[PDB]
Design a protein around this ligand. Structure first.
Ligand SMILES: Cc1c(/C=C/c2cc(CN[C@](C)(CO)C(=O)O)ccc2C(F)(F)F)cccc1-c1ccc2c(c1)OCCO2
Lengths: 126, 126
């Protein structure tokens, strides 16, 4: 039966750095790209939608535009990996990766963000 | 493009009563049951999972045990309707209905629950 798994369910990252969080799913030697759907979101903001083997940019959230991409190279290994550059305090929260490949499943990932005072203060008046 | 829609995105219900919330999805011609997946959850608890045309209760949250059913009659109309009997204060919150049928999509529904004092008080301690 179809199942998504996470190697890690918690990431602790530094304000200003780059992050890759991952969802694994089974591919039996070889990917059928036509049938694959990958959707990632955080608190109901869309981050990427990979359908018919291509990213759809239209429905991506503001926060994420050209900061967030799916590492397409990994897909044939059964790895939907999300890369986000220049982490902000507001990137902290619970992420879900939703995968349709025959079956469907999803998983959740918690992101914590450490930040120095000047950064936390700017966010404190948001 | 495949889309799930909600006729209503907010329900206000009374403690002790029965609730049916709804999610529409497109069905052309005849319904293909083999391909259909319907999943409902609230705050990461599984409520029902209908796959290969059958409910799988093994994975159900114990809150919902024998209170929750999917109206199977409605499916061929393109309606995934969830019924919960004997609504409790703890059933208030955000529900998501997730559907795979060719494409995949989800929607969100908020349920509020009115309750009298005696009920709220018992919940206030437990
Ligand atoms: C993920 C999914 C599902 C899966 C849900 C699900 C979930 C869990 C629950 N997962 C865990 C947490 C661990 O495994 C558990 O706590 O158990 C268990 C069982 C199932 C099932 F069988 F019902 F599907 C159902 C329909 C659609 C989608 C879906 C996929 C891709 C999408 C999309 C929707 O819409 C936007 C575009 O991209």
């Amino acid at each position: 039966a179809f199942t998504v798994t996470v190697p890690k369910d918690l990431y602790v990252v530094e304000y200003g750095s780059n992050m890759t969080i991952e969802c694994k799913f089974p591919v039996e030697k070889q990917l059928d790209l036509a049938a694959l759907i990958v959707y990632w979101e955080m608190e109901d903001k869309n981050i990427i939608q990979f359908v018919h083997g291509e990213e759809d940019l239209k429905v991506q959230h503001s926060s994420y535009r050209q900061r967030a991409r799916l590492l397409k190279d990994q897909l044939s290994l059964g790895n939907a990996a999300l890369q986000i550059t220049d982490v902000k305090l507001q990137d902290a929260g619970v992420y879900r990766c939703m995968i349709s490949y025959g079956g469907a499943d999803y998983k959740r990932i918690t992101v914590k963000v450490n930040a120095p005072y000047a950064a936390a203060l700017e966010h404190h008046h948001h």
